[PDB]
Amino acid sequence: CETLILEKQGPTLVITINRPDVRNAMSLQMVAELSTIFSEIENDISIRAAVLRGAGGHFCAGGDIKDMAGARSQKAGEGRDDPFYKLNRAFGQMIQQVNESSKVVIAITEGAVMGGGFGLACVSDLAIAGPTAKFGMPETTLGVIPAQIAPFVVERIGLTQARRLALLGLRIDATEACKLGIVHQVAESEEQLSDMLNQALERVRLCAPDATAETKALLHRVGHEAMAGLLDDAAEKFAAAIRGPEGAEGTMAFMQKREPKWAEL
Amino acid sequence: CETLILEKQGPTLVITINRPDVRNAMSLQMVAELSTIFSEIENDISIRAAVLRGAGGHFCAGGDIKDMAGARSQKAGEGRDDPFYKLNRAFGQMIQQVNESSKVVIAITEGAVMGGGFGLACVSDLAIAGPTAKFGMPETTLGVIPAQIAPFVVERIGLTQARRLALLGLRIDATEACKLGIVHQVAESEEQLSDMLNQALERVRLCAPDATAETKALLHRVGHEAMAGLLDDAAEKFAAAIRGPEGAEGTMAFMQKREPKWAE
Amino acid sequence: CETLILEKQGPTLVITINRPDVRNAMSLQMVAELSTIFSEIENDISIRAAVLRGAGGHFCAGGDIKDMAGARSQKAGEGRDDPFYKLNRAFGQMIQQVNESSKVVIAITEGAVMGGGFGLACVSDLAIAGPTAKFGMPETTLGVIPAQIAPFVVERIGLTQARRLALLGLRIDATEACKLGIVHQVAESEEQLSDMLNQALERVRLCAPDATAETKALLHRVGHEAMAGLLDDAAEKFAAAIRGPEGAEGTMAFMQKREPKWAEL
């Protein structure tokens, strides 16, 4: 990886965004590497959680002006052939992919949180903010549509709060972001961040990977199909988990007050 | 009823979940009794609210291990004839049915709130927690899918807050449950809990029964169909209500600065 | 306009509801004039924002009895032809229209906010409450279904908080209204109300009109079609904006550390 530092750490992969020189501005190249890492871990057993963090006290400054310059310089198509379409769309593919990943996705969100980075925060299972975290959508002030980001902001916090943020192009701080639900928690120091992150990784260790993945997929279906058919499907998944190896293991563990296999070390 | 105490009390049915010995663990039998009570009152016009409360300071400890034992020992099945399927699915049927009941459903949640109990709280029109209420999804921790509960958590508080509770299997206190919208209010004493309950029941007395039920049914349709057609249907319901008994009665009551008949 | 005082200031149309005599009870005539104004400005490119305010310290005290009496007098009919149908439906028509307007809609809500007024507040891009603001749904208390208003309350604040307000016929104050998301901010006094308005109008000045409009329409689509197809269309809108007058102008503005033309004082 050119753009990211990877580190295994028990059942959890730490992904550090590694371009502190340009405040982690997000380039097409990064997008592709993120897409790749998430595709590779998707059907991997040892990885239960993925932590997203930026090197240098900044999560993401925005896009990379260079990819835009690059795309202007290419031949103009008009459709999905247009280099600006292709450039922009890949941000949404990757964000959506991360949203639907079978892994527990944790975003540690420091300093600037913009563009693609704001999107990633909007699709995490847990987001923790550092006290300098700033979240903004200045796009319309530049005559640009926040096309790939705003839709995840609507899912994240709802239409009512998203309207205000997106259409007035506001920049907000960690405390307001937490109140709105962009992030779940705010840490008042670099220390508290660590504790909060560790507590959450503790939680990941105790939770069963297959059950966690099946649950997560059920959650994304709520509200997009009738509840009754969803619950039918949910009950089949329950019956299947009970008769499969994880549920078997989990029963034994509660019998003897001991930790289950997936939770050891 | 064997798992529930039913007490009528004006236009309000008080349903007390009554297995204090096992801190109100929810059994298939309880599921069936709840489902039956709610079908029976669905049209009984003298009942306007149902209050759900657990005896002995706990709402629901979880599922009944004995129902699972029972299912294990039955003959295994393919898919929807699997006994685990039937057992689990019945919980979601009851919860969905409570959610769509034409009555105003108030939940009073104290102590442990888990499994079916958590689901019921997530499906109430008003939920009031006592200071000791704890809400947890420990399921994935035991290699179990919280299949019939988590979906109602998502409906109740949104995907963003539900993914965190469910996927980290957290257990939260009343204040956090209120802040997220699992419950609407938190009492700080048993007394404050009674008063809030009584204020809510007073509001139920003042509200017209057929209009409350029609309104409720429309609230559930929002976001599951095109808004323009919903408003069309809603305007027909408006017209019908105005023609009918309650509208007539309601306008007069306001004209004569007096309580309407359903408030009696 | 018979019920409304209209005032233009910059690209902001200030619409003042003007029946202080009856605390701004919303008549069928008011509904018709509101719908007319929003139809006309929909293309007028000199208007960027519409501000809704009430005269005399109240936003809307409810429906107009006169319209109801009028409707009882008319020939009864069935379904679409029922005069009660017609009377009711038009309120939702207008509210939906205002919800989807291309303009940034700001609601300034004081005193009573009920009926159509509550509905409007629930479809604003930004709502600011003054300290006297009171929001209620007394309809079922009168044997009436709040048919046109409640569906927007559900979109505004969610089913969970809306079931309580609506089905117990509650009336709440400004700070509870803010906590639930009916309004986005609350003022302590008159002059704070003015600052908040001016700050919002400043943000409107800085945001480019066409991009604001395209973004707003993408936002209303979220949750009502598959995400992937929506991001497809979003990227198309992004490309077209980049290659349009507004996008070219905006990059310029940022090249020469100068305001873009749409910001022009």
Angle at B135 between CA A100 and CA A217, to 5 degrees: 15
Half-sphere exposure of C65 (CA within 13 A, CB side): 4
Angle at A157 between CA C250 and CA A111, to 5 degrees: 60
C20 contacts: CB under 8 Å, gap ≥ 6: C54, C55, C56, C58
Alpha-helix residue ranges (DSSP H) falling in A74-189: 83-99, 115-121, 150-157, 159-167, 174-180
Question: Helix, strand, or coil here: A149?
Answer: coil
Whether B236 and B171 map to the same domain: the answer is: no
H-helix or E-strand spanning residue B34: helix B28-41
Q: Select from B181, B119, B171 the least CA-distant residue to A203.
A: B171
Nearest neighbour of A238 by CB, restricted to B147, B155, B158? B147
**Beta strands at C126-129 and A12-17: parallel, antiparallel or unpaired:** unpaired
- Two tokens at A178? 């937490």
Please give the Cα distance from C157 to A159 (Å, whole number).
9
Yes or no, beta carbons of A140 and C222 under 8 Å apart? no
Nearest neighbour of A219 by CB, restricted to B93, B150, B224? B150
Please give the Cα distance from A120 to A141 (Å, whole number).
22
Q: Which amino acid is at C81?
A: D
Q: Which amino acid is at A45?
A: I
Please give the Cα distance from C114 to C109 (Å, whole number).
10
B40 contacts: CB under 8 Å, gap ≥ 6: none
The answer to whether B49 and B204 have CB atoms below 8 angstroms apart is yes
Number of H helices, E strands in chain C: 11, 9
Please give the Cα distance from C70 to C61 (Å, whole number).
19
Q: Which chains are adjacent to chain A, needing at least 3 Cβ pairs under 8 Å? A: B, C
Please give the Cα distance from B251 to C160 (Å, whole number).
29
The answer to whether A16 and A55 have CB atoms below 8 angstroms apart is yes
The answer to whether B178 and B185 have CB atoms below 8 angstroms apart is yes
Whether A165 and A242 map to the same domain: the answer is: no
Please give the Cα distance from A14 to A6 (Å, whole number).
6
Whether B222 and B203 map to the same domain: the answer is: no
- Two tokens at B15? 């349903």
Please give the Cα distance from B219 to C159 (Å, whole number).
7
C28 contacts: CB under 8 Å, gap ≥ 6: C64, C67, C87, C90
Domain that holds residue A76: 1-207
For residues C93, C160, A96, A81, the Cα torsion angle rounded to the nearest 10 degrees is 0
Please give the Cα distance from A239 to A244 (Å, whole number).
9
Q: Which amino acid is at C247?
A: G
Burial of A221 (0-12, 13-18, 19+ CB in 10 A): middle
Angle at A248 between CA A247 and CA A253, to 5 degrees: 90
- Residue bearing tokens 């995400």: C227
Positive or negative, the CA dihedral B14, B20, B25, B27 is negative
Alpha-helix residue ranges (DSSP H) falling in C54-189: 65-73, 83-100, 115-121, 150-157, 159-167, 174-180
Question: Helix, strand, or coil here: C252?
Answer: helix
Yes or no, beta carbons of B231 and C151 under 8 Å apart? yes
Q: What letters, b where the CB count within 10 A reaches 16 and e where it falls short, cover B233-257?
A: ebbbbbbbbbeeebbeebbebeeee
- Two tokens at A60? 């993401």
Chain A residues in contact with B158 (beta carbon < 8 A) = 158, 181
Q: Select from B161, B148, B25 the least CA-distant residue to B98.
A: B148
Q: Tell me which DSSP letter residue B44 carries.
A: -
Please give the Cα distance from A17 to C232 (Å, whole number).
26
For residues A195, A197, A198, A202, the Cα torsion angle rounded to the nearest 10 degrees is 140
C257 contacts: CB under 8 Å, gap ≥ 6: none
Q: Tell me which DSSP letter residue C110 carries.
A: -
C69 contacts: CB under 8 Å, gap ≥ 6: none
Whether C96 and C161 map to the same domain: the answer is: yes
Q: Which amino acid is at B112?
A: A
**Beta strands at B4-9 and B12-17: parallel, antiparallel or unpaired:** antiparallel
User: Which of C219, C246, C261 has the most A C-beta neighbours within 10 Å, making it the best mutation to test the interface with A?
Assistant: C219
Residue of A nearest to C213 (CA): A167
Whether A67 and A181 map to the same domain: the answer is: yes
Alpha carbon A29 to chain centroid, angstroms: 18
Please give the Cα distance from A9 to A47 (Å, whole number).
9
β-bridge mates for residue A13, sequence order = A50
Yes or no, beta carbons of A203 and B89 under 8 Å apart? no
Q: Tell me which DSSP letter residue B103 carries.
A: S
Q: Tell me which DSSP letter residue A9 carries.
A: B
Q: Tell me the residue length of chain C.
A: 265
The answer to whether B126 and B159 have CB atoms below 8 angstroms apart is no
- Residue bearing tokens 């527990």: A104
- Two tokens at C149? 């208003």
Q: Which of A207, A242, A257 is the last residue of a domain?
A: A207
Yes or no, beta carbons of C219 and A162 under 8 Å apart? yes
Yes or no, beta carbons of C167 and B207 under 8 Å apart? yes
User: Does any CB of chain C come closer than 8 Å to the CB of residue B260?
Assistant: yes
Nearest neighbour of A236 by CB, restricted to B85, B161, B162? B85
User: Does any CB of chain A come closer than 8 Å to the CB of residue C251?
Assistant: yes
Whether A106 and A49 map to the same domain: the answer is: yes
Within 10 angstroms of residue A225's Cβ, the number of other Cβ atoms is 11
CA distances from B197 to B70, B201, C95, C138 (A): 38, 6, 35, 19
Whether A140 and A226 map to the same domain: the answer is: no
Please give the Cα distance from A47 to B65 (Å, whole number).
32
- Two tokens at A189? 């120091």
Within 10 angstroms of residue A43's Cβ, the number of other Cβ atoms is 9
At residue B76, φ and ψ (nearest 5 deg) are -55, 155
- Two tokens at B4? 């529930």
Positive or negative, the CA dihedral B78, B81, B85, B87 is negative
Yes or no, beta carbons of A216 and B164 under 8 Å apart? no
Whether C129 and C104 map to the same domain: the answer is: yes
- Written as one string, the DSSP assignment of A31-77 is HHHHHHHHHHHTT-SS--EEEEEETTS-SB--B-HHHHHHHHHS---
Shortest distance between the Cα of B138 and any Cα of chain A, in A, equals 9
Please give the Cα distance from C64 to A125 (Å, whole number).
48
What strand order describes the sheet that includes B12-17?
B4-9, B12-17, B49-54, B104-109, B126-129, B185-186
- Angle between the C227-242 and A83-99 helix axes, to the nearest 10 degrees? 150
Shortest distance between the Cα of A11 and any Cα of chain C, in A, equals 30
Burial of B198 (0-12, 13-18, 19+ CB in 10 A): exposed
Whether B215 and B198 map to the same domain: the answer is: no
Please give the Cα distance from B54 to B31 (Å, whole number).
14
Q: What is the CATH number of the domain that holds B237?
A: 1.10.12.10
Whether B144 and B220 map to the same domain: the answer is: no
Burial of A188 (0-12, 13-18, 19+ CB in 10 A): exposed
Please give the Cα distance from A237 to A216 (Å, whole number).
12
What strand order describes the sheet that includes A112-113?
A112-113, A134-136, A171-173
Q: What letters, b where the CB count within 10 A reaches 16 and e where it falls short, cover B28-41?
A: bebbebbbebbeeb
CA distances from B67 to A34, A170, B31, B47 (A): 45, 53, 11, 32
Angle at A30 between CA A29 and CA A34, to 5 degrees: 120
Q: Which of B161, B179, B207 is the last residue of a domain?
A: B207
Nearest neighbour of A151 by CB, restricted to C207, C222, C249? C222
Shortest distance between the Cα of A200 and any Cα of chain C, in A, equals 28
Q: Select from C240, C79, B157 the least CA-distant residue to A85.
A: C240
Nearest neighbour of B163 by CB, restricted to A219, A228, A241? A219
Q: Please report, in angstroms and rounded to a whole number, the separation of the first and last CA atoms in chain A.
A: 29
Q: Which of A191, A207, A223 is the last residue of a domain?
A: A207
Deposited experimental method: X-ray
The answer for B 65-94 residues in CB contact with A (under 8 A) is 76, 79-80, 82, 84-85, 88-89, 92-93
Question: Helix, strand, or coil here: B113?
Answer: strand
Q: What is the CATH number of the domain that holds C49?
A: 3.90.226.10
Chain C residues in contact with A92 (beta carbon < 8 A) = 228, 231, 234-235
Whether B149 and B262 map to the same domain: the answer is: no
- Two tokens at A187? 């840490």
Q: What is the C-alpha R_g of chain A?
A: 20
Whether C162 and C38 map to the same domain: the answer is: yes
Q: Select from A232, C17, A230 the least CA-distant residue to B88.
A: A232
Question: Helix, strand, or coil here: B214?
Answer: helix
The answer to whether A214 and B145 have CB atoms below 8 angstroms apart is yes
Question: Helix, strand, or coil here: C263?
Answer: helix
What strand order describes the sheet that includes C134-136?
C112-113, C134-136, C171-173
Positive or negative, the CA dihedral B15, B21, B23, B28 is negative
Please give the Cα distance from A50 to A32 (Å, whole number).
17
Beta strands in chain B (DSSP E): 4-9, 12-17, 49-54, 104-109, 112-113, 126-129, 134-136, 171-172, 185-186
Domain count, chain A: 2
Within 10 angstroms of residue B211's Cβ, the number of other Cβ atoms is 27
